[PDB]
Design a protein around this ligand. Sequence first.
Ligand SMILES: NC(=O)c1ccc[n+]([C@@H]2O[C@H](COP(=O)(O)O)[C@@H](O)[C@H]2O)c1
Length: 182
Amino acid sequence: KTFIIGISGVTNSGKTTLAKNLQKHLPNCSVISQDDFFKPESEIETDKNGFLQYDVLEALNMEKMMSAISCWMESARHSVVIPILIIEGFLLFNYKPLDTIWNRSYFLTIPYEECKRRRSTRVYQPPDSPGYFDGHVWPMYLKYRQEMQDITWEVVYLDGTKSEEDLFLQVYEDLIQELAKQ
Ligand SMILES: NC(=O)c1ccc[n+]([C@@H]2O[C@H](COP(=O)(O)O)[C@@H](O)[C@H]2O)c1
């Protein structure tokens, strides 16, 4: 009845833009962004070096996100008199409760050098502290990729250095084939 797409990947790799571009070309499609479920700074912990622990599941209210997904599911049942949900976020594929929800999974990748450069041009709240990328972001990303070594479902890895349109066309082409097989 429904088709759920997961778009994860390294930080600042065009995940939200890809989700939005796909949505504009798919009927009855909604998007849920993991970034909307981060806990407030006051609830974030710090490591031995004083770095805020934002790049781990503990920094997110995943129970609240599951509730949001369940709400979409209920809405989807009344949207037709196929409903598509795209869930996008940097830490989705290591969350066990959702391991069986994915009908198709995409993962945006960008090498260390370029990822660091792009991250610096972006402003977060709170802003990245000095040395935050090498001290927390990248190490946690590597931990995430390590956890994914034992992933239990198929993931399509994407080159995040490709253009917005290139990525959209690539994923759309794949998605329509998957929808057809359903
Ligand atoms: N959303 C917030 O309120 C918030 C606050 C501080 C740091 N961050 C950063 O956002 C990143 C993930 O979001 P993106 O995948 O969009 O870059 C994480 O790597 C994290 O370090 C987000």
